[PDB]
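Journal club side-thread
Mid-discussion, someone asked how the predicted structure for our own chain would compare to the paper's figures. Pasting it here so we can look after the session.
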Amino acid sequence: LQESAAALVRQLGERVEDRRGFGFMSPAIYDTAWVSMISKTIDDQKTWLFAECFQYILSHQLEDGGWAMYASEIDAILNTSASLLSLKRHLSNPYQITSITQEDLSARINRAQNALQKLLNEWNFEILVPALLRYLEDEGIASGRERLLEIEQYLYLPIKVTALHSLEAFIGAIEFDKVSHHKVSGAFMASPSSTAAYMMHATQWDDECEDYLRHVIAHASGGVPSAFPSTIFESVWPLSTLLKVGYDLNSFIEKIRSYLHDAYIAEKGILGFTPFVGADADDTATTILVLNLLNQPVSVDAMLKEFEEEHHFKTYSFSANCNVLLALLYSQEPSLYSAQIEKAIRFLYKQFTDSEMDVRDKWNLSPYYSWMLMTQAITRLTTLQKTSKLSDSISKGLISLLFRIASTVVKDQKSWGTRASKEETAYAVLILTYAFYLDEVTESLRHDIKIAIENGCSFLSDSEWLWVEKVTYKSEVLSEAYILAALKRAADLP
């Protein structure tokens, strides 16, 4: 149990020696579609740099002509459109890739065209779909996207933005030689698709970007992931998930905790999913929790005065708030940050009351995830209040909300999830292992909670596209972490 938990610490620890970083995100057809379009001038001859990505795109085409739907129709539309654009590009300029012809590729293009036509006729994300449609229409093939995907240059400054992850959607007008300064370890916000667009449309070829892309292709999970490296995210999300349920792994974790401490020191406490790629409230708060529960106190003020606003915590609206709440509740003196703890626990309750107990969580695609985080925070607050470590109507509402969550979850048991995913099942059973100890829960409700926990842990004992991203991705470390955390937390039940 703890050895498997330690393995996650070691897996982050073993990747510390790697200078580029670590990667646990699954490849996304969108990104490798953008990497398959890279052409390099070698010996005065233009050749496609990465034919393995082109083969990856060719091998993922479905019978209908489209690509994988993953978790949302936007995923299918994006993968199909990017892959079909790549097919058009390689039809126009086959160069040195003789695997595909000018007729088989034309047949593939027609199939993908009809598939995307069907998808658009069924469709009623924001900047990736219209951009892909424009790119496809510039190379043949005729409300749609232009009913909601029209809400909306700011990349020449050294300040990093989230558009460095989706730069491939701005090929129409962008000075990539100007964005070349936005290069860390040869990357562009760790997004292979953005670096692929850069290398395609850079005036001056950068061998460093080619080396980074080769590292990604040969060290990811030809298909490239959405973000690479993903060191801090894939290192601290498992550790925090294991630590919050009380996994004891302090004593190969040394190389992971030391690297995380170094990342905290260099990044001034605010950490993204990788070094020098940004900072999200969830990521930094989770890393702070990991350091605090790994016998190394770090002041939460580093993220507190970066990701705190009125009545809620920002993210650069639920997952960040609850992760910050959990980080605060596990600090050295949770009574000192009582104001922000109350702020978060009130904001989440208000959101639940205003959303009919149905709310999502930015990073994940399962409401079970939000219910799990809320149950964790509520039960930690209750335990602190009972033990007097942390000091009326709001509390009664919180207890009633936890009871309603427990009852609705019990009624929502299928085994859990709408797609038979272990992550959603783990979230749903973790939303009940913290609702089992409520003193206001009746005997029948408690029995139902125990039965649902048993039936969820049976399902638990593995990665599905539940983690949002330009294209939703599945990470093995996240799934394993939540499974282990739920199993241990249920094992703590009387």
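Post-session note: The longest helix spans residues 73-92.
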